[PDB]
Design an enzyme around this catalytic site. Sequence first.
Site, PDB file in Angstrom:
ATOM      1  N   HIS A  44       0.761  -1.230   0.083  1.00 28.46           N
ATOM      2  CA  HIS A  44      -0.095   0.046  -0.086  1.00 28.46           C
ATOM      3  C   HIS A  44       0.787   1.345  -0.077  1.00 28.46           C
ATOM      4  O   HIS A  44       0.405   2.350  -0.396  1.00 28.46           O
ATOM      5  CB  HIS A  44      -1.132  -0.008   1.245  1.00 28.46           C
ATOM      6  CG  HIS A  44      -0.384   0.376   2.432  1.00 28.46           C
ATOM      7  ND1 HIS A  44      -0.034  -0.488   3.422  1.00 28.46           N
ATOM      8  CD2 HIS A  44      -0.076   1.697   3.061  1.00 28.46           C
ATOM      9  CE1 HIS A  44       0.633   0.312   4.460  1.00 28.46           C
ATOM     10  NE2 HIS A  44       0.546   1.552   4.275  1.00 28.46           N
ATOM     11  N   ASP A  91      -0.058  -7.334   1.884  1.00 34.67           N
ATOM     12  CA  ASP A  91       0.410  -6.028   1.665  1.00 34.67           C
ATOM     13  C   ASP A  91       1.874  -5.980   1.797  1.00 34.67           C
ATOM     14  O   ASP A  91       2.489  -5.655   2.722  1.00 34.67           O
ATOM     15  CB  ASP A  91      -0.233  -5.264   2.777  1.00 34.67           C
ATOM     16  CG  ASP A  91       0.024  -3.738   2.800  1.00 34.67           C
ATOM     17  OD1 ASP A  91       0.670  -3.261   1.921  1.00 34.67           O
ATOM     18  OD2 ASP A  91      -0.330  -3.015   3.720  1.00 34.67           O
ATOM     19  N   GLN A 186       0.904   6.044  11.493  1.00 29.28           N
ATOM     20  CA  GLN A 186       1.425   6.526  10.004  1.00 29.28           C
ATOM     21  C   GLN A 186       2.906   7.099   9.963  1.00 29.28           C
ATOM     22  O   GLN A 186       3.223   7.690  10.706  1.00 29.28           O
ATOM     23  CB  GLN A 186       0.426   7.674   9.725  1.00 29.28           C
ATOM     24  CG  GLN A 186      -0.789   7.067   9.311  1.00 29.28           C
ATOM     25  CD  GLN A 186      -1.719   6.748  10.550  1.00 29.28           C
ATOM     26  OE1 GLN A 186      -1.358   6.993  11.822  1.00 29.28           O
ATOM     27  NE2 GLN A 186      -2.875   5.967  10.189  1.00 29.28           N
ATOM     28  N   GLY A 187       3.362   6.779   8.647  1.00 28.08           N
ATOM     29  CA  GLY A 187       4.863   6.643   8.493  1.00 28.08           C
ATOM     30  C   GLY A 187       5.606   5.473   8.935  1.00 28.08           C
ATOM     31  O   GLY A 187       6.877   5.654   8.541  1.00 28.08           O
ATOM     32  N   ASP A 188       5.281   4.775   9.774  1.00 28.48           N
ATOM     33  CA  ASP A 188       5.947   3.445  10.218  1.00 28.48           C
ATOM     34  C   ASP A 188       5.498   2.344   9.101  1.00 28.48           C
ATOM     35  O   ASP A 188       6.305   1.210   8.865  1.00 28.48           O
ATOM     36  CB  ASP A 188       5.428   2.786  11.356  1.00 28.48           C
ATOM     37  CG  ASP A 188       6.134   3.842  12.468  1.00 28.48           C
ATOM     38  OD1 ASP A 188       7.342   4.483  12.233  1.00 28.48           O
ATOM     39  OD2 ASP A 188       5.428   4.268  13.617  1.00 28.48           O
ATOM     40  N   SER A 189       4.670   2.492   8.351  1.00 29.91           N
ATOM     41  CA  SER A 189       4.300   1.234   7.250  1.00 29.91           C
ATOM     42  C   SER A 189       5.201   0.937   6.315  1.00 29.91           C
ATOM     43  O   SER A 189       5.792   1.653   5.970  1.00 29.91           O
ATOM     44  CB  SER A 189       2.727   1.788   6.646  1.00 29.91           C
ATOM     45  OG  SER A 189       1.601   1.535   7.488  1.00 29.91           O
TER      46      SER A 189
END
Length: 239
Positions: A44, A91, A186-189
């Site tokens: 993603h 993912d 958010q930002g760690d994905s």
Amino acid sequence: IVGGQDATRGMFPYQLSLQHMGAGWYHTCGAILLAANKALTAAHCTEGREGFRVLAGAHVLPANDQEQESDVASVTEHPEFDRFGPGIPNDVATMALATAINAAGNVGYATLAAANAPDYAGDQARLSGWGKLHGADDGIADTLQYVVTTVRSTADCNARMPEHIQNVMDQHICVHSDTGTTGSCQGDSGGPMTHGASGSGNVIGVTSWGIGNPVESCLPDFPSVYARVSYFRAWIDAN
């Protein structure tokens, strides 16, 4: 990362900053360095987009302190990646790097969980990345963060989930603290889940999704869901 702390330089030599091109570079996701010209991230992070680079050996993003970097030449998302299906299945994605990244200094290649690995339920693990420190924050973290947490079983993950979001699968690996104070954001994905509480550990997960509410985009009160590396090991190696 929520509830964590500054990493020490070289703690996660395979931790990459995946950056997307807009009005300048911006860190959009974490990535995992697998080899000189190959990286791993969440599908993603890349689906429908192009124009990427990865930073290796970075610590403080605003300081431009990366030891190495490379443009992304191509991306291969999992063919069965379903971004908007329940649980965001499959993912994972590999990336071909235009410039070779050498194992030197604070940069090294990750060791991945084997295809026959156990589920690690109840084991300690670490999450790392430059994600937001709190769900209500406007921006990401400046210094690389990490936190120690606990891997949970599939049923344990879904029990800790909101009743309408019990979509954790065996292809996932989730972590959750009983204090409900730690997790990804958010930002760690696309970043790694490292096995163990300290020292060298296998990368056993790829940051995928979590739970938010109208005021916080990420909540440590609920588990953080990663793509299980052991489930996708054969595919990652082959693509």
